[PDB]
Design a protein around this ligand. Structure first.
Ligand SMILES: [Cl-]
Ligand SMILES: [Cl-]
Ligand SMILES: [Cl-]
Length: 73
């Protein structure tokens, strides 16, 4: 998705803060949209990291964030 607020904020916030934000947002997407994938997505975020999803989640109008679950797994 594209969100001016989170896109601009994430571009200059420290890495620990952006990581916390992305991880929270991805697990919230899972909770709302495909709650049965919680354990699998959580383990994949721990194994692969979360910073790689910054662009698609916040700075990309063409990405529907519901599709982050398929992106992660
Ligand atoms: Cl504005
Ligand atoms: Cl938009
Ligand atoms: Cl899926």
């Amino acid at each position: 998705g594209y969100d001016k607020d989170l896109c601009e904020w994430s571009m200059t916030a420290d890495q620990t803060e952006v990581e916390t934000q992305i991880e929270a947002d991805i697990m919230n997407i899972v909770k709302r949209d495909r709650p049965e994938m919680k354990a699998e997505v959580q383990k994949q975020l721990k194994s692969g990291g979360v910073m790689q999803y910054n662009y698609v989640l916040y700075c990309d109008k063409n990405f529907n964030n519901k599709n982050i679950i398929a992106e992660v797994v």
